[PDB]
Design an enzyme around this catalytic site. Structure first.
Site, mmCIF file in Angstrom:
data_model
loop_
_atom_site.group_PDB
_atom_site.id
_atom_site.type_symbol
_atom_site.label_atom_id
_atom_site.label_comp_id
_atom_site.label_asym_id
_atom_site.label_seq_id
_atom_site.Cartn_x
_atom_site.Cartn_y
_atom_site.Cartn_z
ATOM 1 N N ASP A 73 -8.746 4.004 -3.039
ATOM 2 C CA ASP A 73 -9.776 4.234 -2.016
ATOM 3 C C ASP A 73 -11.055 4.788 -2.635
ATOM 4 O O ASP A 73 -11.396 5.957 -2.477
ATOM 5 C CB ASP A 73 -9.246 5.185 -0.934
ATOM 6 C CG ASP A 73 -8.103 4.586 -0.123
ATOM 7 O OD1 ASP A 73 -7.935 3.343 -0.105
ATOM 8 O OD2 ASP A 73 -7.370 5.372 0.514
ATOM 9 N N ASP A 78 3.115 5.293 -3.634
ATOM 10 C CA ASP A 78 2.777 6.293 -4.635
ATOM 11 C C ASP A 78 3.016 7.711 -4.119
ATOM 12 O O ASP A 78 3.733 8.497 -4.756
ATOM 13 C CB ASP A 78 1.324 6.129 -5.145
ATOM 14 C CG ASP A 78 0.260 5.968 -4.022
ATOM 15 O OD1 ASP A 78 0.560 6.073 -2.805
ATOM 16 O OD2 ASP A 78 -0.922 5.746 -4.378
ATOM 17 N N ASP A 135 0.835 -1.190 0.000
ATOM 18 C CA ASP A 135 0.000 0.000 0.000
ATOM 19 C C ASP A 135 0.882 1.258 0.000
ATOM 20 O O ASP A 135 2.011 1.218 0.472
ATOM 21 C CB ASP A 135 -0.873 -0.048 1.242
ATOM 22 C CG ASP A 135 -1.987 0.985 1.226
ATOM 23 O OD1 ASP A 135 -2.372 1.482 0.137
ATOM 24 O OD2 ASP A 135 -2.466 1.285 2.337
#
Ligand SMILES: [Ca+2]
Ligand SMILES: [Ca+2]
Ligand SMILES: [Ca+2]
Ligand SMILES: [Mg+2]
Ligand SMILES: [Mg+2]
Ligand SMILES: [Mg+2]
Ligand SMILES: [Mg+2]
Ligand SMILES: [Mg+2]
Ligand SMILES: [Mg+2]
Ligand SMILES: [Mg+2]
Ligand SMILES: [Mg+2]
Ligand SMILES: [Mg+2]
Ligand SMILES: [Mg+2]
Ligand SMILES: [Mg+2]
Ligand SMILES: [Mg+2]
Ligand SMILES: [Mg+2]
Ligand code: NI
Ligand code: NI
Lengths: 1247, 458
Positions: free
Chosen positions: B457, B398, B395
Site C-alpha cells: 500500500d 502476511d 492479499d
C-alpha cells in the site's frame, strides 16, 4: 559458540563426502558434503549423527542434478574436493572449510574461532566484498539501498511488499543459502557473513530443524541466482496475457467495467486484464460468500457469460482473495464456512476471530461552536425527536482516531454540542419536555446544557491488567466517578459489564460474577446503564440465575429509593451537588477520607461499599465518624474504624450498605418504570440522632421545566432523638404543584412507643402496620424489624400546616416473625401477560389480598427478606388449595432450588393452611421465590397469602473463609468436600488465626460446632478465645492421612447479648496445621444445616478449574475429551450457568461419547437418597443423553435428558442405598454437535 | 515572570475594589476585585488597563448575586476587604493578595516572588493541604486517586471518559477557578498552587484572553462546590425516567427491542429506557441520513407509532449522535448535507474529511500449511474460476492489524496460499490453464507456485 572438532573419519563416494567429527562422546558429529553441480555445494551438519529434520518448504522437493564427477582427495591435510569451477578445502584439526575458485582465489572460510555449529553458520570473507540479499523494504518502512554490508535485519517474508530470506551473496563471487524458517543473518565490514536460527521469530516458527542444511554457490551474479533457483525452484511460466497492462480497481460493477474497457479500446490504449477487489464476491455472507460471485454487482457472472464476453473483448479477470473466512452472517449467526473450518481444524494456529470492516464512508466533523451551525444541527434533528429519540447520546465529541485522521475537538465541544440540543429542544417544545443527554468528556460549563458524563470504552475485566492492560476495568471506576464529582460533574455513569474485550466485539462478555458485582455497583451510581460492544448482549437473564436474581434485587432497591434520589436531582439544579459524593465532602479533616474511593455516599444518608473483588469472602470497610447501621443485616457499628465485613461469595447477594445516624429516607413501592402509577403512600425511614436532621421531600411533573417558575411541591421532614422521646416534624407543604402523595408512613427506628402525639392529641393506636395502613385518618402502631424496635406513624401529606409528632415510652413488640404479604411482593412469569397476579375474590386472606395465577408455567412470586445472620430459618407459607388434591411449587432461595413443596388441599379456595419449611438463609438480603417450575415437575395451581420469617434462626452458621484471618491464615479450594465457596488453611505459625463475629440474642451458654480437617494422622490443637478471654484448648483428632475428610468439633461458650468475637488461634503451646470450614452456633443441640445437605464434591462446578475435584471423566480411547467447565460468557449471546459462575459442558464438533462420574460414601447406609441436577441441551439430538445412578446396591437408574434448549431439572428419587456408596454421573453418545450443560448437581438424604 | 508592582490607586465602590498598579509606563495595570457572595471573590487582572477579553463558555452568562455589603478599608497597608466568612488583605508595596478566613486563619497567598501576571495565577498555601480537581482519568490511561498534591497534568475535556478544568480546591478550606480554554495547573508539596495559560494546547484554543479572570472560594467542600456552580452554572433537572435503568445496545432492530422489553417486564426487572447505536439511523445515506430513522431496522418509526407503543410500555428511546456528517454516500456522490455544511462554513476548523468504517464483520484466518486445508480452499474456489476469476490476487497473507488483533502469518504462508491455487488449478484443468497469482510478501520457494510480488500500500 564452539566450532567443530577434529576430523576422525572421511568417506568419499562419487560426488559425496561424509566426515565424522570428534565431540568427546561416542555419538560423533556428522558433516555431509554433496557436490550438486560444478559450482554448487550442499552441506548438512548433523550434531551427534542424529537423523536430519525434514527440509522446510524453501527447498524444491523435486530438485535433480546430473552427476558432476568431482575429485575428492582424502589422502592429506586439508581434504580437497575439486570441480572445474571450485576448490573446497576442509582442514582436519579442527574441521574448518575454505571455499576457493578453481584457480585458487579464496572466496570465504570458516574462521578458527568457529564455523558451522548447532544453531547456524559462520563465515569470514573479504571485508570490502559487497553483500546482497537477505531483505527488501515494506510500504511502512524507510527504504534503503541494495547493499547489505552491515546488516542485522532478520530473514522473513515480512508484510506490505517486503521480501526476505536466509540468502546472502556477493558480487565477489559466492553465495550462501540456509534452509530455515526465519532466522538472523549477520554481516559487518570486518568481513563476517553469518546466519543464526536464534529464538522463535516475531512471525512464529513451524518448521524446526535439528540439523544445519546449507548451500554454497560459486560464480558471477547470474550463476549464483541460477543455483538459487535449482535449490528452491524455478518459476512456472505465467500466461502470456500477464505481460500486458492490468487495471486493478476497488469500487466497480459490471456497467462501470464495460465502460472502462470501451474507454481503453476506443483509444487504442492496450490492456489485458482487470482485477476486481471486494466488489466481485459476496464477502460477508453465509454459504461461502467470499468464494461466490456477487451477481448484484456482476449480473452476467450468474453464468459463464461475463467471462466469455470479456474474453471476446480481450479481457481476463483477476479476483481478490483474503486467507480468511467470515465466521458470522449479518444476522449474527455462525456461517457454514465457520462450521466446516472449525470442525476440521483449518484456522491459522494462534489466530482467533477478529473484527474487520470493508465498506468505508467519508465523513467530516461539524463545528458546534457557531450559533448558526447549532441551529442547523437542531433543525435537522426535529423529525427524529418527534418519532421517539427523546435523549441524545452524544458520542465522540472529543477526538477522531481513524487512519491518518487524528483530530482533536476543543474543550467546549461537549458543552456546545449539548447546547445545540438543549436550546433547540427547549424552544421547540416551549420548555415542555426536559432534555437528557450524555457525553464522554466534561469541561466546566457543559453542565448548563443538561448532559451527563460516561466513562468511555472501558474494559470487561475486574481491574486494569487482569485480562489486558490497555483499558481499565470495574475496580478503577469509583476513582473516575469521584474524580468527576470533584470537578462538579456528579451526573456520571459507566458501561456496566464493560465494553472492550480481547478480540474486539467477538471477544468475551463479562463472567456472571463480574456482571453481578458490576450491576450492584452501578445501581448505586447516578446514571445506571449497561452497554456492550457490537452484537453483544447485556440483559441480566443471559448470565444465569444468580446474576438475574441479584441484579433484579438491587434494581428493586434502587427503584424503591426514587423519592430519595429525586430530591438530589433537584439539589443539583440549585447547588450543582448530586446523588453521589466522596466521603471527603462530609469529612474534610479525616486523613482516612482524603483519598478514599472504595466507599462513597449515595445521597446524604447512605454509605455504600460494593463488593468489587473476584472470589471476595470479606471486605475491610472504613466507616468515618458517627454511628452506622447495616441496611440489610441490622447491626450497629461505631464510626471512626475499619470494620471486617463478611460476604457470601457463594450467593453474591451482599451489597454492603450502611445507614448514617440521623438518616431520613423516603421510599416507595417498586415500579417497573418511574411513572407506572401514582404513588399515594410514601414511606419515610427515620433513624433519629441526638442532633436534629432533615430531608426535604420533593415532587414535580418529572417532565417539563415548569419547576423553574414554582410548579413543584416540597415538605421539610425533620427528626431528633430527645432524652426519652423522638420528635418528628412534617413541615407545611410549599409550592403550587399538587403532589400524588396523600399519606406518609413514618417508620421511626430505635423505639417502640407507648404513645404517639400530635398537637396536644394522642393518636389512635392500631394493632400492627397492616391495620394502620388499612385505616383512614392518622394513627400509629409499633413492631419489630431487622433493626430492632420500630414505631409506625401514618399522617396526611401536603397539609397547609406543620405537624409535630412525638413518640414516647417503650413497649417492645413480642413478635417472633416478620410478615411478608405476597401481594406486595415481585410477581413474574414467562411473558408479560402470564405473570402471577393479585386478587381478592376468595375470603380469609391477610392484608389487602393474595397472589393467584400461579397456574401458567414459570409464574412466580419473589420476596426480599432480611436475615441478621446466616443459618436455618423455618419459613411459614400461608396458602389455599381448593383443587381437590395436592399441588406442588418450587421454593428457590438465592437462586438455588431448595425444595419442591407439596401443598395439601385445604378444603376450599376460601380456606387457608400453612406449610413451614427450613430455608438456608444468608446474612443480609435473601431472595425467596415460590414458582411454578413446570420444567422441574411442579403442578402449580395454588394461591399464596403471605410468608413469615423468624427474626432469629434456629441455628446460625459462620463461614471460616469469611472470618477475619491473621498471622498467615488464608483461604483455599485445594482439598475436597468443603462447604460454601472455600475453607481456611495455613494455620501454621504461632499467631495464625480465624476470628468469627458471632451474634447472640441474649447472654448465656451456646453450643458451637467447628467443621475442620486434620489429615496429618495425629491429634492437633488450637486455642479458642471468646471475647478476648482466657484461652481454652481445642483438641482436634485426625481420621487419617486424608485432607478430604471433615469432622465436627463440639464445644460450649459463654456469650454476651449482641456481637461476640470467637477466635481459633495457634498459641505457642498449640500445634496448628488443621483446616477450618464453618462455625455453627445454637442455643440447642446443633443438627445438620439446611445449607449443608449436598453429599457431592463440586456438584455446582464452581471451584476454580485450576483445582481438581471428586469428579472423574471418561471418553473412548483415542477420542479427545468433550468435557469442560466454564462460564459460557465467551459465547454470543452468552449461555450461562444455572447458578453462580460456572457449569460443566459436553461438546464436540464431531461424533463423540463422554461421561463424568462421582462416587461418594453415604453417611447412613440402608437409607434413601435423591439425585437432582440442572441440565440444558441444544443442537443435534444425541443417541443417548442421561443422568445415571449406580453402585448403590440396586440396578442402574437412568434419567434421560431432552433436547429442548432450556434449563430443566432432572430428578432420580428413591435411591435405596445398601452398598454404603453411590456413583452419580452423566453420559452422552452423540453423532456430533450435541452441546449438553450440567449444573447444580446434588445428592441428598431423601425425607 | 514578574509579579505586580506597587498600588498607586485604590477605589472602593459597593462590593468592588479597583486597584491601579505601577508598571513603569503611562498605562498602569488594573486589578479589579468583586465580592460576589460572602465566600466568593472575583479577581480580574487587566495588564496596562486594557479592556478585558470576552469570558469563555465556562462562565454562566446569566449569573447574578445579591449584594453582600462587604467592608472595604483602603485607609492603610494592607488594604482589607471583609465579609462574615473571609478576610482579603492586599499589601500595597508590591501588590500581593492574602486570603484568610474571617477568624484570621491564612488559607492561601501570593508569594513575594509574584502572584497574578499576564499568563496566569500563582499562590502559595500549606504544604500538607490536600488538593482536588484539575483532572480525571480516561478509558485508556492508568487510573490514579482523588488527590492532586503533585500535579502537572493539563486542564482539558480530554477524551474517552476524561474530565478536567482549571479548578483546584482543598479540604483545607479554599478553591481557585480560572476562566480559561485549556491551560496548565501546577501543584507540589512545597505548597505551590498555580495556573498557566501556556502555549496552544493539544486540543487547540479558540478563546484567547488578554486579561486573567479568576475566582477564589472560601469554605468547606460543599460550599466550594456550590460557589463553583454559581460561577459556571447549575444543572437543569433531567427527566425523572433518567434515574431508572437504561440498556444501551449496538446491533438491534424493532423485533429484538420488543423482545428485550418483554423479557424485562415479564421478570419484573425495572427499566425505563433503551439507547440505540447506529442501528436507529440511516447513517451513510444522502438527504441527512445520519438524522433520519432507519425504517428497515425500525418499521414503526416511519410515523410516531414506535414512540407511542414504547411509551405505553414505559420505555423512552435514546439515540446515538456523532458530531460529523457523511460527505459522500455509499454510491460516491456528494450528499446534500455536505453542500449545506460546506456553503455555510459548518465544518470544524482544521478538520478535513476522512474515510471511516462502521459496519463490522467477524473473520478468522485460515491455515494454508495443511494439505487438507488447501484442498478445501481450492474446492470452494472452482465455481468462481469457471465463471471468470483466472488470476488470484492473494492479499494480506502476511499480517493482521485490527484493533487488539495483531496476528502474524508464518514465512511459508504466501508459498502455501499460492500452492493451494496452483495445485488445485493444475489438477482441475489437467495442466491446460496457466496459473497467475500475486501476493504482497515473498520467502524463498514461493516462486514454485506461480506468484508475483507487489510492493503493498504505497
Ligand atoms: Ca395477603
Ligand atoms: Ca467453607
Ligand atoms: Ca454452577
Ligand atoms: Mg548428484
Ligand atoms: Mg565498501
Ligand atoms: Mg537447535
Ligand atoms: Mg470505480
Ligand atoms: Mg459493450
Ligand atoms: Mg449473491
Ligand atoms: Mg388464568
Ligand atoms: Mg449449592
Ligand atoms: Mg454583587
Ligand atoms: Mg497573554
Ligand atoms: Mg443485539
Ligand atoms: Mg409486544
Ligand atoms: Mg431509510
Ligand atoms: Ni523486513
Ligand atoms: Ni486528562
Amino acid at each position: 559458540m564452539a566450532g567443530l572438532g577434529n576430523v576422525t573419519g572421511a568417506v568419499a563416494s562419487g560426488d559425496s563426502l561424509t566426515l565424522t567429527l570428534d565431540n568427546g562422546t561416542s555419538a560423533s558429529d556428522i558433516l555431509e558434503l554433496d557436490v550438486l553441480s560444478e559450482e554448487l555445494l550442499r552441506v548438512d551438519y548433523r550434531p551427534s549423527g542424529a537423523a536430519p529434520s525434514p527440509s522446510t518448504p524453501m527447498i524444491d522437493p523435486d530438485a535433480s542434478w546430473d552427476a558432476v564427477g568431482a575429485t575428492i582427495d582424502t589422502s592429506g591435510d586439508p581434504i580437497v574436493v575439486t570441480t572445474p569451477r571450485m576448490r573446497i578445502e576442509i582442514a582436519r584439526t579442527p574441521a574448518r572449510m575454505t571455499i576457493k575458485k578453481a584457480d585458487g582465489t579464496t572466496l570465504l572460510w570458516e574462521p578458527a574461532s568457529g564455523g558451522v555449529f548447532e544453531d547456524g553458520v559462520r563465515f569470514q570473507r573479504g571485508s570490502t566484498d559487497n553483500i546482497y540479499g537477505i531483505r527488501s523494504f515494506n510500504a511502512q518502512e524507510d527504504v534503503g539501498g541494495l547493499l547489505r554490508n552491515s546488516s542485522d535485519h532478520p530473514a522473513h517474508a515480512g508484510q506490505q511488499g517486503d521480501a526476505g530470506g536466509p540468502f546472502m551473496w556477493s558480487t565477489a563471487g559466492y553465495g550462501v543459502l540456509v534452509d530455515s524458517d526465519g532466522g538472523y543473518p549477520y554481516t559487518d565490514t570486518t568481513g563476517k557473513l553469518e546466519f543464526y536460527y536464534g529464538g522463535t521469530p516475531t512471525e512464529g516458527r513451524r518448521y524446526t530443524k535439528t540439523n544445519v542444511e546449507y548451500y554454497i554457490m560459486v560464480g558471477e551474479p547470474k550463476e549464483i541466482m541460477a543455483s538459487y533457483a535449482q535449490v528452491t525452484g524455478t518459476a512456472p511460466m505465467l500466461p502470456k496475457w500477464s505481460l500486458g497492462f492490468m487495471n486493478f480497481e476497488w469500487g466497480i460493477d459490471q456497467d462501470e467495467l464495460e465502460a472502462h474497457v470501451d474507454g481503453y479500446r476506443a483509444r487504442n490504449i492496450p490492456i489485458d486484464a482487470f482485477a476486481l477487489d471486494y466488489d466481485w464476491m459476496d464477502y460477508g455472507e453465509d454459504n461461502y460468500g467470499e468464494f461466490r460471485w456477487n451477481t448484484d454487482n456482476f449480473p452476467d457472472a450468474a453464468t459463464t457469460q461475463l467471462k466469455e464476453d470479456m474474453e471476446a473483448e480481450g479481457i481476463r479477470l483477476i479476483g481478490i482473495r483474503k486467507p480468511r473466512i467470515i465466521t458470522r452472517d449479518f444476522a449474527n449467526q455462525r456461517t457454514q464456512q465457520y462450521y466446516d473450518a472449525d470442525s476440521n481444524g483449518y484456522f491459522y494456529p494462534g489466530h482467533n476471530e477478529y473484527t474487520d470492516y470493508f465498506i468505508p464512508v467519508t465523513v467530516r466533523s461539524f463545528d458546534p461552536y457557531q450559533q448558526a451551525s447549532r441551529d442547523w444541527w437542531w433543525q435537522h434533528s426535529i423529525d427524529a425527536f418527534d418519532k421517539g429519540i427523546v435523549g441524545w447520546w452524544n458520542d465522540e465529541t472529543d477526538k477522531v482516531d481513524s487512519g491518518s485522521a487524528q483530530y482533536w475537538f476543543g474543550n467546549f465541544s461537549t458543552g456546545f454540542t449539548s447546547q445545540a440540543m438543549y436550546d433547540g429542544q427547549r424552544d421547540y417544545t416551549n420548555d415542555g419536555v426536559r432534555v437528557w443527554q450524555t457525553a464522554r468528556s466534561y469541561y466546566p460549563g457543559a453542565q448548563r446544557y443538561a448532559t451527563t458524563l460516561w466513562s468511555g470504552d472501558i474494559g470487561t475485566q475486574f481491574y486494569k491488567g487482569e485480562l489486558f492492560n490497555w483499558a481499565p476495568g470495574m475496580q478503577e471506576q469509583p476513582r473516575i466517578m469521584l474524580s468527576s464529582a470533584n470537578l462538579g460533574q456528579p451526573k456520571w455513569g459507566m458501561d456496566t459489564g464493560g465494553f472492550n474485550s480481547l478480540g474486539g466485539a467477538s471477544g468475551p462478555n463479562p463472567s456472571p460474577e463480574l456482571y453481578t458485582r458490576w450491576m450492584q455497583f452501578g445501581a448505586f451510581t447516578p446514571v445506571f446503564r449497561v452497554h456492550g460492544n457490537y452484537n453483544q448482549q447485556r440483559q441480566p437473564w443471559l448470565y444465569g440465575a444468580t446474576a438475574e436474581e441479584a441484579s433484579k434485587a438491587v434494581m428493586h432497591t434502587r427503584y424503591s429509593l426514587l423519592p430519595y434520589m429525586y430530591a438530589y436531582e433537584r439539589e443539583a439544579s440549585e447547588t450543582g451537588l448530586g446523588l453521589i459524593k466522596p466521603l471527603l465532602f462530609d469529612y474534610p479533616n479525616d486523613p482516612q477520607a482524603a483519598d478514599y474511593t472504595e466507599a462513597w455516599m449515595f445521597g446524604d444518608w447512605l454509605l455504600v461499599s460494593p463488593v468489587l473483588g473476584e472470589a471476595q469472602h470479606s471486605k475491610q470497610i472504613y466507616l468515618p465518624a458517627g454511628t452506622w447501621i447495616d441496611y440489610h443485616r441490622g447491626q450497629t457499628y461505631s464510626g471512626g474504624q475499619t470494620i471486617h465485613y463478611p460476604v457470601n461469595a457463594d450467593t453474591w447477594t451482599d451489597v454492603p450498605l450502611f445507614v448514617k445516624q440521623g438518616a431520613i429516607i423516603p421510599n416507595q413501592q417498586v415500579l417497573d418504570y418511574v411513572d407506572q402509577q401514582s404513588v399515594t403512600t410514601v414511606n419515610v425511614d427515620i433513624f433519629p440522632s441526638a442532633s436534629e436532621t432533615s430531608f426535604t421531600y420533593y415532587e414535580d411533573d418529572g417532565s417539563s421545566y415548569d419547576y423553574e417558575s414554582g410548579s413543584s411541591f416540597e415538605q421539610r421532614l425533620a427528626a431528633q432523638d430527645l432524652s426519652s422521646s423522638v420528635r418528628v416534624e412534617v413541615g407545611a407543604g410549599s409550592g403550587s404543584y399538587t403532589p400524588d402523595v396523600q399519606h406518609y408512613v413514618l417508620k421511626i427506628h430505635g423505639r417502640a412507643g407507648s404513645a404517639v402525639t400530635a398537637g396536644g392529641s394522642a393518636l389512635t393506636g392500631y394493632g400492627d402496620l397492616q391495620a394502620l395502613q388499612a385505616a383512614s385518618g392518622s394513627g400509629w402502631a409499633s413492631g419489630r424489624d431487622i433493626y430492632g424496635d420500630v414505631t409506625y406513624v401514618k399522617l396526611p401529606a401536603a397539609s397547609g400546616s406543620a405537624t409535630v409528632v412525638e413518640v414516647s415510652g417503650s413497649a417492645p413488640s413480642a413478635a417472633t416473625h416478620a410478615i411478608y404479604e405476597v401481594e406486595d411482593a415481585s410477581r413474574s412469569g414467562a411473558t408479560p401477560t402470564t405473570r402471577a397476579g393479585i386478587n381478592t375474590n376468595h375470603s380469609g386472606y391477610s392484608g389487602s389480598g393474595f397472589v393467584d395465577k400461579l397456574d401458567v408455567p414459570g409464574a412466580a412470586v419473589t420476596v426480599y427478606a432480611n436475615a441478621p445472620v446466616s443459618g436455618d430459618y423455618p419459613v411459614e407459607l400461608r396458602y389455599a388449595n381448593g383443587s381437590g388434591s395436592a399441588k406442588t411449587l418450587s421454593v428457590y432461595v438465592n437462586a438455588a432450588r431448595v425444595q419442591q413443596l407439596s401443598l395439601a388441599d385445604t378444603g376450599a379456595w376460601s380456606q387457608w393452611g400453612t406449610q413451614t419449611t427450613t430455608l438456608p438463609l444468608t446474612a443480609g438480603q435473601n431472595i425467596i421465590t415460590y414458582k411454578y417450575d413446570s420444567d422441574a415437575g411442579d403442578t402449580g395451581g395454588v394461591n399464596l397469602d403471605y410468608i413469615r420469617v423468624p427474626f432469629a434462626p434456629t441455628q446460625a452458621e459462620y463461614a471460616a473463609e469469611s472470618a477475619k484471618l491473621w498471622g498467615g491464615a488464608g483461604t483455599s479450594q485445594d482439598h475436597w468436600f468443603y462447604k460454601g465457596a472455600a475453607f481456611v488453611d495455613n494455620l501454621t505459625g504461632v499467631g495464625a488465626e480465624a476470628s468469627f463475629d458471632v451474634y447472640a440474642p441474649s447472654a448465656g451458654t451456646y453450643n458451637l460446632s467447628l467443621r475442620y480437617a486434620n489429615g496429618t494422622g495425629s491429634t492437633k490443637t488450637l486455642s479458642a478465645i471468646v471475647n478476648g478471654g482466657a484461652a481454652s484448648t481445642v483438641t482436634l483428632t485426625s481420621p487419617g492421612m486424608n485432607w478430604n475428610l471433615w469432622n465436627e468439633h463440639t464445644m460450649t461458650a459463654t456469650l454476651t447479648a449482641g456481637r461476640n468475637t470467637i477466635s481459633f488461634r495457634r498459641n505457642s503451646g498449640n500445634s496448628g496445621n488443621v483446616n477450618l470450614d464453618r462455625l455453627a452456633v445454637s442455643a440447642s443441640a446443633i443438627t445438620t444445616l439446611a445449607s449443608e445437605r449436598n453429599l457431592l464434591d463440586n456438584g455446582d462446578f464452581e471451584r476454580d478449574t485450576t483445582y481438581n475435584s471428586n469428579w472423574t471423566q471418561w471418553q473412548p480411547s483415542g477420542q479427545p475429551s468433550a468435557f469442560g467447565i466454564d462460564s459460557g460468557n465467551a459465547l454470543h449471546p452468552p449461555e450461562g450457568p444455572a447458578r453462580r459462575n460456572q457449569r460443566a459442558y459436553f461438546h464436540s464438533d464431531n461424533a463423540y461419547q463422554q461421561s463424568i462420574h462421582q462416587v461418594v460414601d453415604v453417611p447412613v447406609n440402608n437409607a434413601t437418597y435423591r439425585l437432582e441436577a440442572k441440565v440444558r441441551m441444544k443442537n443435534t439430538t444425541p443417541t443417548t443423553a442421561r443422568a445415571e445412578v449406580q453402585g448403590h446396591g440396586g440396578s442402574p437408574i437412568y434419567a434421560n435428558i431432552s433436547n429442548d434448549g432450556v434449563w430443566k431439572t432432572i430428578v432420580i428419587d428413591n435411591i435405596n442405598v445398601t452398598s454404603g456408596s453411590v456413583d452419580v454421573g452423566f453420559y452422552v453418545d452423540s453423532p456430533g454437535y450435541t452441546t449438553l450443560h450440567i449444573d447444580e448437581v446434588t445428592l441428598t438424604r431423601a425425607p
